[PDB]
Amino acid sequence: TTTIEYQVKDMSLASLGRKRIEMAEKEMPGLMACRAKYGEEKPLNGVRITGSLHMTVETAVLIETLKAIGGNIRWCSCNIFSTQDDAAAAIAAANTPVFAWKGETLVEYWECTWKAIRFGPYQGPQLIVDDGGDATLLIHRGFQAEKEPSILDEDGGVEELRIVNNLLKRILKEEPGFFSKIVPDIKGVSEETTTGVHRLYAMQKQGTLLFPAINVNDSVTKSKFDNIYGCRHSLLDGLNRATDVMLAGKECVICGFGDVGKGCAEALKGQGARVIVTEIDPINALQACMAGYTVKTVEDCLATADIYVTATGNKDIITLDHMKKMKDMAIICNIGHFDNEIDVLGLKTCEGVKEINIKPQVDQFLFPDGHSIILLAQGRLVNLGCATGHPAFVMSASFTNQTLAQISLWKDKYEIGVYTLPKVLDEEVARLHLEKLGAKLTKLTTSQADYIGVNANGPYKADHYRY
Numbered sequence: 001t002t003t004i005e006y007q008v009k010d011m012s013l014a015s016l017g018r019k020r021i022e023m024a025e026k027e028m029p030g031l032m033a034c035r036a037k038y039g040e041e042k043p044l045n046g047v048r049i050t051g052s053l054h055m056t057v058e059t060a061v062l063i064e065t066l067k068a069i070g071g072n073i074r075w076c077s078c079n080i081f082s083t084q085d086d087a088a089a090a091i092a093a094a095n096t097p098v099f100a101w102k103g104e105t106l107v108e109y110w111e112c113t114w115k116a117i118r119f120g121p122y123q124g125p126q127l128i129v130d131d132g133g134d135a136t137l138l139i140h141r142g143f144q145a146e147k148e149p150s151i152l153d154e155d156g157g158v159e160e161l162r163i164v165n166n167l168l169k170r171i172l173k174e175e176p177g178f179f180s181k182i183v184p185d186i187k188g189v190s191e192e193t194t195t196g197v198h199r200l201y202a203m204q205k206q207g208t209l210l211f212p213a214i215n216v217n218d219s220v221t222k223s224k225f226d227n228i229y230g231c232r233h234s235l236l237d238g239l240n241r242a243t244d245v246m247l248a249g250k251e252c253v254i255c256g257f258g259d260v261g262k263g264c265a266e267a268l269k270g271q272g273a274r275v276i277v278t279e280i281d282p283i284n285a286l287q288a289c290m291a292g293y294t295v296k297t298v299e300d301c302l303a304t305a306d307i308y309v310t311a312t313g314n315k316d317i318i319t320l321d322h323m324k325k326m327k328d329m330a331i332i333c334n335i336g337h338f339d340n341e342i343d344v345l346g347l348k349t350c351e352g353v354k355e356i357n358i359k360p361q362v363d364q365f366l367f368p369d370g371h372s373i374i375l376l377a378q379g380r381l382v383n384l385g386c387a388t389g390h391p392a393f394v395m396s397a398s399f400t401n402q403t404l405a406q407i408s409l410w411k412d413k414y415e416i417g418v419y420t421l422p423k424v425l426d427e428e429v430a431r432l433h434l435e436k437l438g439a440k441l442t443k444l445t446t447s448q449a450d451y452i453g454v455n456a457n458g459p460y461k462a463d464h465y466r467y
């Protein structure tokens with residue numbers, strides 16, 4: 001019945017990855033609580049689960065939690081540089097299909113996404129774990145291409161869209177109507193990150209969303225923990241391993257002051273950096289002012305700034321024109337999305353600019369006047385591409401949300417639309433992580449609960465409370 005199938009860099013790394021997974025398990029009380037609560041009953045028993053999410057040690061604990069509660073799983077990474085090859089080998093060695101390695105080409109990246117989606121002839125996932133929406137995109141675009149085949153000849157100059165179109169042309173030639181066949185079996189997708197959730201709301205607004213979606217990013221125990229304190233840890237780690245640069249006394253520019261930018265600026269400040277924030281939103285800008293940061297434009301900073309971190313989810317933050325005017329050896333990295341926050345394509349196609357590799361994921365771009373910039377991870381996620389991403393404890397919060405979302409998509413009735421988990425579940429995720437930290441929660445008396453108008457067991461806040 002069950003065939004072994006995987007594609008990883010180096011299976012001899014499996015034992016090392018398995019040791020790191022065992023360490024991570026002891027840092028992830030929320031995921032272990034999910035195994036303890038659901039491991040016998042197996043609410044996801046036999047349910048086909050496709051995952052597209054950074055193949056890290058932390059993700060390995062999520063995969064094997066979903067497996068412990070019954071899932072029939074296939075996995076790929078959502079980023080060409082974020083896979084930890086030893087974690088991928090350890091997952092493959094424990095007989096879960098995984099198609100992921102550090103340093104994929106874009107063609108390989110999309111081929112792995114397709115491998116993780118296709119469970120068999122005319123068979124796809126019933127649940128999807130997604131991070132950034134690329135697996136969701138492939139399914140929606142393949143479905144659309146059955147009705148509108150001309151979109152597969154339209155890339156709009158974008159090389160990656162050409163790659164996706166070529167893949168979908170081949171898929172639909174091999175299995176005509178594949179996506180209209182498998183889409184009715186998809187019970188839903190749970191989406192990890194701000195950018196992927198933006199794609200979901202856009203599809204829902206246009207009425208093109210094909211199945212229910214849980215916005216996991218906007219659990220309070222995800223957005224206000226992972227995005228902030230995960231980055232506070234892992235931006236520093238990515239910069240350290242890539243460059244070993246001392247931050248103290250350096251002028252560091254954080255582009256964007258949402259949840260990611262807030263955690264990045266706090267990390268930099270704690271290491272003695274002079275932190276500058278850029279923002280388009282006057283509210284987030286005023287928050288940066290109240291925290292003691294200087295709020296400027298990128299243009300204002302070019303003559304003096306030492307390091308640039310893009311954290312916007314937007315494009316064209318750091319342009320070729322900017323980089324021409326930067327100080328020599330300025331470090332440029334992206335912790336937001338994709339690879340277009342920095343104009344890497346412009347760097348690579350500007351005839352006078354010479355690219356010189358320093359070490360893996362660290363590249364010098366030398367300009368005719370003799371100054372250079374240092375680009376990290378080809379402009380992709382620096383925390384995951386140059387280091388190991390967020391640490392396990394905070395990913396346990398994000399991934400406990402993922403696990404509860406998966407169970408809910410399977411067990412509960414959803415209409416097509418985008419949903420968030422109930423506040424009582426959000427509160428439960430937080431509860432599951434308090435004991436490990438030694439925190440002791442206060443219990444309301446009956447009189448106190450009446451006075452503020454809540455059930456003593458929650459939820460404790462109005463639905464639009466912002467924390």
Ligand SMILES: NC(=O)c1ccc[n+]([C@@H]2O[C@H](COP(=O)([O-])OP(=O)(O)OC[C@H]3O[C@@H](n4cnc5c(N)ncnc54)[C@H](O)[C@@H]3O)[C@@H](O)[C@H]2O)c1
Pocket residue numbers: 193194195196226227230231255256257258259260261278279280281284311312313314317335336337381382383390
């Ligand atoms: N690397 C990681 O581990 C990690 C973790 C969580 C989220 N993310 C990603 O980080 C990105 C940001 O996430 P978030 O949750 O902070 O989103 P967010 O919406 O809360 O914050 C982004 C901010 O960027 C600002 N911004 C937009 N365009 C700008 C521009 N041109 N110049 C300056 N500022 C601009 C917006 O005003 C906004 O406040 C997303 O792509 C998200 O998916 C990455």
Ligand SMILES: Nc1ncnc2c1ncn2[C@@H]1O[C@H](CO)[C@@H](O)[C@H]1O
Pocket residue numbers: 053054056057058059131132192193194226230384388389390391395398
């Ligand atoms: N070690 C990590 N393992 C898995 N996912 C991570 C890790 N660090 C950050 N991420 C996720 O990557 C997303 C961005 O693609 C963030 O929303 C975050 O949840």
